[PDB]
Write a protein that binds this DNA or RNA. Structure first.
Lengths: 103, 150, 110, 142, 55, 48, 117
RNA sequence: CCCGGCGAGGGGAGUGAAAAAGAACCUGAAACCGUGUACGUACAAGCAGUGGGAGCACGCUUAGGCGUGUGACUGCGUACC
RNA sequence: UGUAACGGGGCUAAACCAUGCACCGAAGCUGCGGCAGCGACGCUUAUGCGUUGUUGGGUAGGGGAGCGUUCUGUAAGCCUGCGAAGGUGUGCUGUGAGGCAUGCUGGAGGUAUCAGAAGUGCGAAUGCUGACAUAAGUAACGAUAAAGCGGGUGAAAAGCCC
């Protein structure tokens, strides 16, 4: 019942109804992002693999939020050469609720 | 530092650190490395810099409408309730009152008032002009600061 | 009821007193008092004095029932260590510490 | 989503019988090590012992190529003054017949607790009998 | 003879684990006194197996 | 204006250098003087 | 104007000891050894971000190799057939299907075997 | 008032707004020493972490799972100046 | 010193040579997401806004830009005994020094913004002062002239009195 698609240069294997967190999409919250770039559609044992952007089937998702992740800290340090550097980072993301698996 | 000129131990042989005197700023009860001194921090401004700065301050005070001009500021009695009354009439809680002749009858009844300073036309300083919430001067003092600055 | 009783600045080490303090942690109070009676340690005498003070305070300051009582919580902590000076050979001194300790016992019915 | 990992209480295992007659020691031990680690199952995670149980019959018929019957030496040190012992291969066929396969598979496993468990899965027997008939070992062929 | 670097609370606690004083098992109850004493020692008041030996 | 609004012109103050304050200030731990030598010592240096 | 630097040194040391909450021994209590442990943990986190991005790919490769060899084709010819049939499913999803559903993985084995010979 | 040596020290009562303000007396840190609870630990080798991570423990909860603590097992990894 | 001259297992190929094709393999490169600098380009130059290319390992060092601490002006104003500073947690927040909110302890001070002056920022100096660790409940208890018993005193007697 799961569809394999590509969102942010990387793949996700989503199922119907569940939510996935992926890359930042310049899309308002109460909207719907469509992915026709599905790579595999599996339902039952009737599977559909194809030469990519396979045929017909699509994914219809509704964006939930745009939160940042937990702060990763990056420390560079060279032993006894008088150099250390500290740098935080927080990556944006986007929560989508997959609500449609086509043919 | 009140102390002696003697090493607290030998230079070599004792396992402690080297030490030359008990007055050095590393030690406790001995001190300041770079000692401060009696000095003077007053710094110079030109006559033309101070004059142009006062001109800029007075012109900005007019362009913020805090500068009020009256012809004569007159109280006859040195009682401070009278000056408090005359500033109650003109809605002035906190002023700087420049006069051209420092008559003593207004310097008297302003000393117990905090928010009121009464100075002379020659006694104009920048931070007290900027500091007070209103600045009033007699028009006689307006002419006198016209003659002194320009 | 907690019924705490303590003895502060007990002039002995904290560790040696702690050794016999680990004996009576979790006993009925009669077995504890007899086992502190028949120990060959000075710290047993100290903790026996503190234990009779705690039992007497639990029976006095509140009601009764010595036979119900159980030592829940005993602990010894280190107290203010006082200093002396021990003179040693070739002129070097040694600062030695006479150590004191706090003994505390807490008995209850449950 | 994360990747899949095998939880150790979920693992099923199979029981196997290997006939070592005339199959060479290194290639047989290679297939036993590959089956022992669990690299034949898709549910492999490297921190979980997943590989099957393995029983070996005919452990003294296993042959080596070339002149390795008389020249391969299995050193070990006793941890003493300079008493370092050894044995040849056919002396290990005579004396400790299963230990040739035991050392040869122990050399090809990771070194740690988990390697020790997957080496515990190995049940070598020199005789053609086995007492694990109550475990139902099926047959796999290298 | 001098130590090399200082051990931890664990290596002190492991060595201090073996200093656990065990108690006596149980005191004997006297026949005639009813008082507690050690095995094969006289009581605190002097009776021992029903025989007032020190009075 | 009030007395808490007078700001200097941009580029007036430079706030100076504080030698010996760590890795982050750049200078610090020898404070610009480099390593050993006559130019590194307290009161060191040649004459005119 | 004398500044007493006690409160700010306390803040600076608590800022370290809150980060090193959980290390063994005096790396949790002593400020100096906790400082060395904190910067060493930072370097290890950097290097292990890179090491995770390698290790997980090698795990998916091992899973795909096992699930393919169970189905009758080795891994290298599996990826050669998957590229000459032009399927761009990367190895994370292939390992995920190879663990979960053997049916679609067997279909992919059939497609790769047909694309190869 | 009570334990205790007509001790020290403590438990009560009382004063006080406060006695974990009681004369070692405002606040009361860290190193150090403990007591209890949760988890790990008695066939496993090393700058003691980090990336992955099972199980258990409490909390909740859109009942899916999350959160915090422990972290068996594992790849990498020879402190600071 | 222990095999000990493939890293080991082991390999008659899992060795060597030749041709060839797959595949793995780095922080390289591509992809997606974000930050900053520089060069040009134009929008009307709050010397910003945009489009584009390009760059970003760094010691000695050179340059630019910031955070925080004490005191002064703003401040006889603001917060505050329906709870300040300090202490201790927790949770949000920034690229970083850091900040903000708040539980509990505390029991009367702190101070926005923008400026100004600095005894302005510690891990090391066989640094100084204080507290406390480790070795450790380890060595030792200071002449190998020697103690034993009974009675006393006291809560307790090898050491005190007889």
């Amino acid at each position: 019942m799961y569809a394999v698609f590509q969102s942010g240069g990387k793949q996700h294997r989503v199922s119907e109804g569940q939510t996935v967190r992926l890359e930042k999409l310049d899309i308002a919250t109460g909207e719907t992002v469509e992915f026709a770039e599905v790579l595999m559609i599996a339902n039952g044992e009737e599977v559909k693999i194809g030469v990519p952007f396979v045929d017909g089937g699509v994914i219809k998702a509704e964006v939930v939020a745009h939160g940042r992740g937990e702060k990763v800290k990056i420390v560079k340090f060279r032993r006894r050469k008088h150099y250390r550097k500290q740098q935080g980072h927080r990556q944006w993301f986007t929560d989508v609720k997959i609500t449609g698996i086509s043919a | 530092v009140t102390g002696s000129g003697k090493k607290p131990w030998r230079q070599k042989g004792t396992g402690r650190a080297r030490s030359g005197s008990i007055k050095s700023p590393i030690w406790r009860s001995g001190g300041v490395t770079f000692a401060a001194r009696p000095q003077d921090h007053s710094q110079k401004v030109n006559k033309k810099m101070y004059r142009g700065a006062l001109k800029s301050i007075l012109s900005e005070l007019v362009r913020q409408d805090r500068l009020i001009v009256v012809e004569k500021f007159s109280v006859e009695a040195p009682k401070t309730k009278l000056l408090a009354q005359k500033l109650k009439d003109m809605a002035l809680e906190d002023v700087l009152i420049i006069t051209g002749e420092l008559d003593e009858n207004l310097f008297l009844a302003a000393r117990n008032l905090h928010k009121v300073d009464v100075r002379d036309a020659t006694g104009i300083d920048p931070v007290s002009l900027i500091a007070f919430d209103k600045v009033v001067m007699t028009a006689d003092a307006v002419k006198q600061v016209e003659e002194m600055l320009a | 009821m907690e019924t705490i009783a303590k003895h502060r600045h007990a002039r002995s080490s904290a560790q040696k007193v702690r050794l016999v303090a680990d004996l009576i942690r979790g006993k009925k109070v009669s077995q504890a008092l007899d086992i502190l009676t028949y120990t060959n340690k000075k710290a047993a005498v100290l903790v026996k004095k503190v234990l009779e003070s705690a039992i007497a305070n639990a029976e006095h300051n509140d009601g009764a029932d010595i036979d119900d009582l159980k030592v829940t919580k005993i602990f010894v902590d280190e107290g203010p260590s006082m200093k002396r000076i021990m003179p040693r050979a070739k002129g070097r001194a040694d600062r030695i510490l006479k150590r004191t300790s706090h003994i505390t016992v807490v008995v209850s019915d449950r | 989503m994360k990747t899949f990992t095998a939880k150790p209480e979920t693992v099923k295992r199979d029981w196997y019988v290997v006939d070592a007659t005339g199959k060479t020691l290194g290639r047989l031990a290679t297939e036993l090590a590959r089956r022992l680690r669990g690299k034949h199952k898709a549910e492999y995670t490297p921190h979980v012992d997943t590989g099957d149980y393995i029983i070996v019959l005919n452990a003294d018929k296993v042959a080596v190529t070339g002149n390795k019957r008389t020249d391969k030496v299995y050193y070990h040190h006793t941890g003493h003054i300079g008493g370092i012992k050894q044995a040849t291969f056919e002396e290990m066929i005579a004396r400790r017949p299963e230990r040739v396969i035991e050392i040869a598979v122990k050399g090809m496993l990771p070194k740690g607790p988990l390697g020790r468990a997957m080496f515990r899965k190995l049940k070598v027997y020199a005789g053609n009998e086995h007492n694990h008939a109550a475990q139902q070992p099926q047959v796999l062929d290298i | 003879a001098v130590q090399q670097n200082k051990p931890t609370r664990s290596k002190r606690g492991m060595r201090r684990s073996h200093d656990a004083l065990t108690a006596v098992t149980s005191l004997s109850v006297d026949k005639t006194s009813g008082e507690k004493h050690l095995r094969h020692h006289i009581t605190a008041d002097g009776y021992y197996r029903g025989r007032k030996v020190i009075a | 204006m009030r007395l808490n609004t007078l700001s200097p012109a941009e580029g007036s103050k430079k706030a100076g250098k504080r030698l010996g304050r760590g890795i982050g200030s750049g200078l610090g731990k020898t404070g610009g003087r480099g390593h050993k030598g006559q130019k590194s010592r307290s009161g060191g240096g040649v004459r005119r | 104007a004398r500044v007493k630097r006690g409160v700010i040194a306390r803040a600076r040391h608590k800022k370290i000891l809150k980060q090193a909450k959980g290390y063994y021994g005096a790396r949790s209590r002593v400020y100096r050894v906790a400082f060395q442990a904190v910067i060493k943990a930072g370097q290890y986190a950097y290097r292990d971000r890179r090491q995770r991005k390698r290790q997980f790919r090698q795990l998916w490769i091992a899973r795909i190799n096992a699930a393919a060899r169970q189905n009758g084709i080795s891994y290298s010819k599996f990826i050669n057939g998957l590229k000459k049939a032009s399927v761009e499913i990367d190895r994370k999803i292939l390992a995920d299907i190879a663990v979960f559903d053997k049916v679609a993985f067997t279909a992919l084995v059939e497609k790769a075997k047909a694309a190869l010979a």
